[PDB]
């Protein structure tokens, strides 16, 4: 890893990717109707 785990920015960055990832999967399974 070798990253600033303590730095809130790192933790926040992880959330953004994960949040987007979860939404990404939903879009794939999403249907026009």
């Amino acid at each position: 890893f070798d990253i600033d785990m303590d730095a809130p920015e790192t933790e926040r960055a992880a959330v953004a990717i994960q949040s987007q990832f979860r939404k990404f999967q939903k879009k794939k399974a999403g249907s026009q109707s």
Partner: protein
Amino acid sequence: MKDTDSEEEIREAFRVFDKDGNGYISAAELRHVMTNLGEKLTDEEVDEMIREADIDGDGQVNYEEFVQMMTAK
């Protein structure tokens, strides 16, 4: 009028793991990061991510592809 793109915002989140600044991040740290940092992901979620992350046989991941998925829908 016209402003930049938010794509850079998402990349910043990846650049955090790309300490080398070569455009790639270690695949192994991704797993820990996705299971240890921010709403922990499940193995099923992580495995799906790994198949898309890369790890063809180099042990590194290009956040570029992840961004494309995030910007290809």
